[PDB]
Amino acid sequence: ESKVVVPAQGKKITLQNGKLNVPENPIIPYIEGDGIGVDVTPAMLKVVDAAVEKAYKGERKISWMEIYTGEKSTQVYGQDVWLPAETLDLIREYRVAIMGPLTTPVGGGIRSLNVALRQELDLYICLRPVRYYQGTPSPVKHPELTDMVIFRENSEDIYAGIEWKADSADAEKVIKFLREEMGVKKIRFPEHCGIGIKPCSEEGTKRLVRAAIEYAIANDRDSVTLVHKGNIMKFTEGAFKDWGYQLAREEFGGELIDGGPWLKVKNPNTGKEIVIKDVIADAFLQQILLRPAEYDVIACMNLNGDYISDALAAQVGGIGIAPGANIGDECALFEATHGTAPKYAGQDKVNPGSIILSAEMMLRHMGWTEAADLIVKGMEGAINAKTVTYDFERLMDGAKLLKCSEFGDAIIENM
Amino acid sequence: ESKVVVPAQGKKITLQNGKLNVPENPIIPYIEGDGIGVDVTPAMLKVVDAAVEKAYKGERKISWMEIYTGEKSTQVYGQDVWLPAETLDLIREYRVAIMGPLTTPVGGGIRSLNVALRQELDLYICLRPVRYYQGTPSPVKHPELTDMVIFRENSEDIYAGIEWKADSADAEKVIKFLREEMGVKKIRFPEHCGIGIKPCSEEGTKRLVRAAIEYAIANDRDSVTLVHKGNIMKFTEGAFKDWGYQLAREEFGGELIDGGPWLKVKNPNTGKEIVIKDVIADAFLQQILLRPAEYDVIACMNLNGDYISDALAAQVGGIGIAPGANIGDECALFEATHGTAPKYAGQDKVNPGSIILSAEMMLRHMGWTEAADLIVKGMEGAINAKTVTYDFERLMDGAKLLKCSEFGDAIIENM
Numbered sequence A, B: 001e002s003k004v005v006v007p008a009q010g011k012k013i014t015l016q017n018g019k020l021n022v023p024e025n026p027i028i029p030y031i032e033g034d035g036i037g038v039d040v041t042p043a044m045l046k047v048v049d050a051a052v053e054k055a056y057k058g059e060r061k062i063s064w065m066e067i068y069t070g071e072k073s074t075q076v077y078g079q080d081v082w083l084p085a086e087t088l089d090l091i092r093e094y095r096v097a098i099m100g101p102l103t104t105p106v107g108g109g110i111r112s113l114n115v116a117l118r119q120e121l122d123l124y125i126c127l128r129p130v131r132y133y134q135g136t137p138s139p140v141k142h143p144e145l146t147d148m149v150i151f152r153e154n155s156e157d158i159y160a161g162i163e164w165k166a167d168s169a170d171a172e173k174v175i176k177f178l179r180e181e182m183g184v185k186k187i188r189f190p191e192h193c194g195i196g197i198k199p200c201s202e203e204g205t206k207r208l209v210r211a212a213i214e215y216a217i218a219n220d221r222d223s224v225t226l227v228h229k230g231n232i233m234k235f236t237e238g239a240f241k242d243w244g245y246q247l248a249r250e251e252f253g254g255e256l257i258d259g260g261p262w263l264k265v266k267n268p269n270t271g272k273e274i275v276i277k278d279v280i281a282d283a284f285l286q287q288i289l290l291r292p293a294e295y296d297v298i299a300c301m302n303l304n305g306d307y308i309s310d311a312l313a314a315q316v317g318g319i320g321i322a323p324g325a326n327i328g329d330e331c332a333l334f335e336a337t338h339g340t341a342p343k344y345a346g347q348d349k350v351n352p353g354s355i356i357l358s359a360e361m362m363l364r365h366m367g368w369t370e371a372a373d374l375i376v377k378g379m380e381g382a383i384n385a386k387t388v389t390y391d392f393e394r395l396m397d398g399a400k401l402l403k404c405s406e407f408g409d410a411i412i413e414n415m
């Protein structure tokens, strides 16, 4: 029995051809989220409604439709229902949705609902833009140098969840097969040993890299960097790099620079030469701090993208100002980079910036660019006014400390 | 037929009990290293010889014995011999050794010789101290806040090298077994799919964490942070965290703080309360930039330690000033954090600081603390004099740019 209420006065977004048809009164499903979701989400709704109202003076409005996942889903549907089938159906049906963060237990418990949503809806792109907002405090000297966009493969890798507990019959079964049937000798302690599988396919790699390159062309970006650990993980991470370059060559007419393997790809529109390069993952983490300007669009696998996202975000104010999207061929689910930060949950304390800027991406995705620009404007105003949440305040002299809801209002005031 | 010359005027280090017996004329095997190894190594020899000479006025001297691995090994022993059995034997025999960086091909070619040495000699500890040297340029505002020590598990993980090429019979064999015999459904594209194995055992975890805690006690450090991705990789990364805390409890009398899972461990000597805590790996990469002072000793797995090392190093000047050691129960091999940086190889351009400070660790390991202190002193002098190599120079106004050999001499001048 459905527990979701479909808004009376809204219309469904449709996908005519490959293009979205967004009506004036679109129904947008949202998930509140666990933990700080309770704080940041109400604030996102308020701010988005304001930007839409100001940009289009009543012509347009979102019909927000709440749907359930996580703790709240259990309180609605009964225990044990963490991810109602309805929810998956509703996001595919309505094409565009947004969520708060969801809690994943460490060491046991349910598998990540985030990963479940991503995998079940085949949202193979995790798109995370990291840019500096003028006036944002930062622990680095030149944050303005960081203007990157992460394309993170979202459907494979060690992130996929294929693993077995130490001392379990399954684990022992796999170990025996590895040792005896594959002649694997490189397992140092075969007893009391957990096992994980890391898959990486050509189709998975190329669909992610294709998207990254297209984004670079559509946005007149300077380069695309393949990030990988292919010297140690030759057949997964190194495969990723090989496939990525191969794709650039076969589908975008990529050409050698010198002896390579770096490529030049000519922007069909602007005619700019887009550089396709690669960097090893550990080195990259120094590179972003020491030579940020040399990097632009980033394409990487599931785990690496996760590490990179947080490290990059830190350069530019931290993950309270880090938006993202999970994007597939049939729908898109926007959400902040950060998680549920349970230790602050309910305190009206955290930065709603990340989820707000995710809605900003959603609006842009919807072609409501005017509303989106109002959000950006409001953000820059509020930050420049040095009226901010705890995470910014503690890196700053003479700032007024605002609560999460308050900072929401601050953003609106500066629209 | 051996190609190594055993020094006429030196004596072998021995391991009486659990303690090293270091003579006055110890024979120390060294490997030059590929790439920039050709630059940095000669410089390390010069600087170490100087520190030993000054500290002990001729009473002590190292009898350097060259041994072979990598490219140079092929030029000496013939093609195809990248890692002569001799070399493994010589390091175990002589107990203490040092190496330049070694090249690992990305996507194919030989497996990492570094990993080979580590695995073959069971050097399960990769120890990387990251501290700020006064006067070092940096892209962060407060580098002095970074004073950490990385304990990185060095014998397991995805780093172990258990993997198969996409479309290979072996890969297809493993995939079929996973799909059909283990009922694995979470592989998105089973065709054209590379596969990797990630093992993590209880014995491996605990021997690494034991070492980390002992180091914290022997050095009066504030805390030990377990870094892991145990919400996504429950049975490897999460197992690591569980075992680590369990060890702290069972072997060091660790006690709850509040409801935990953080522990208090009482320093037997100083009586200081050492905090045992944990942080998720992506979050940690923001944490080190945003709250560096809150971190001290780091214990993590093979891959994570690798990422963390480079990111931390960047905070403090980059990997031209990042020493490390690979340490086992029977011997220790010191080497810089950085690799072969082939693009600069032979140019006398890179910072020899990392390998030099690795020798600094080696000396300390040998109980030649006076010589070690001379190296530290020389380093601080040379850096404070703003006479430096390219990597520091480019982050600095009004510095004199020195070549690698020159900076070596600068260090000696400031002893």
Ligand SMILES: NC(=O)c1ccc[n+]([C@@H]2O[C@H](COP(=O)([O-])OP(=O)(O)OC[C@H]3O[C@@H](n4cnc5c(N)ncnc54)[C@H](OP(=O)(O)O)[C@@H]3O)[C@@H](O)[C@H]2O)c1
Residues within 6 Å of the ligand: A036, A040, A100, A101, A102, A103, A104, A105, A106, A114, A318, A319, A320, A321, A335, A336, A337, A338, A339, A340, A341, A342, A350, A351, A352, A354, A391, B231, B279, B280, B283, B286, B287, B290, B291
């Ligand atoms: N996409 C997702 O839904 C997602 C992503 C990551 C994690 N998670 C889940 O979240 C749970 C806790 O993970 P975690 O503690 O490692 O990561 P986290 O919830 O992101 O929190 C880590 C730290 O990041 C900072 N932070 C996070 N959100 C912030 C905000 N809105 N404003 C300001 N600062 C913010 C805080 O740093 P300081 O306390 O240092 O100021 C926080 O303690 C886990 O169960 C995990 O599975 C979910």
Ligand SMILES: NC(=O)c1ccc[n+]([C@@H]2O[C@H](COP(=O)([O-])OP(=O)(O)OC[C@H]3O[C@@H](n4cnc5c(N)ncnc54)[C@H](OP(=O)(O)O)[C@@H]3O)[C@@H](O)[C@H]2O)c1
Residues within 6 Å of the ligand: A231, A279, A280, A283, A286, A287, A290, A291, B036, B040, B100, B101, B102, B103, B104, B105, B106, B114, B318, B319, B320, B321, B335, B336, B337, B338, B339, B340, B341, B342, B350, B351, B352, B354, B391
């Ligand atoms: N323990 C080891 O032996 C080890 C460790 C890592 C990698 N490697 C091997 O090294 C090869 C190349 O790896 P990579 O290019 O990704 O890593 P890398 O050789 O460490 O070089 C990456 C970047 O780090 C900086 N850097 C490295 N060493 C430096 C020094 N002595 N002084 C100043 N800056 C330094 C340079 O940065 P900028 O050019 O930006 O100034 C360099 O381009 C690979 O085959 C890999 O297998 C070996």
Ligand SMILES: NC(=O)c1ccc[n+]([C@@H]2O[C@H](COP(=O)(O)O)[C@@H](O)[C@H]2O)c1
Residues within 6 Å of the ligand: A257, A258, A259, A260, A261, A262, A263, B343
């Ligand atoms: N062209 C490539 O494939 C490649 C590979 C590695 C580094 N790089 C960098 O790009 C630059 C290429 O310049 P040149 O080929 O004119 O020397 C170099 O300075 C180097 O730092 C290029």
Ligand SMILES: NC(=O)c1ccc[n+]([C@@H]2O[C@H](COP(=O)(O)O)[C@@H](O)[C@H]2O)c1
Residues within 6 Å of the ligand: A343, B257, B258, B259, B260, B261, B262, B263
């Ligand atoms: N004690 C633990 O196990 C644990 C767990 C997570 C965070 N913390 C941090 O340590 C502090 C513990 O302080 P109290 O238990 O007195 O509130 C908290 O402020 C919190 O930020 C502690």
Ligand SMILES: O=C(O)CCC(=O)C(=O)O
Residues within 6 Å of the ligand: A102, A103, A104, A112, A113, A114, A115, A306, A337, A338, A339, B231, B282
């Ligand atoms: O699924 C989770 O709980 C964490 C996911 C995550 O870290 C991310 O992809 O941002």
Ligand SMILES: O=C(O)CCC(=O)C(=O)O
Residues within 6 Å of the ligand: A231, A282, B102, B103, B104, B112, B113, B114, B115, B306, B337, B338, B339
């Ligand atoms: O083995 C290699 O080539 C790289 C090893 C590495 O990155 C490290 O452990 O520092």
Ligand SMILES: [Mg+2]
Residues within 6 Å of the ligand: A306, A309, A310, A337, B282
């Ligand atoms: Mg994350």
Ligand SMILES: [Mg+2]
Residues within 6 Å of the ligand: A282, B306, B309, B310, B337
């Ligand atoms: Mg490394």
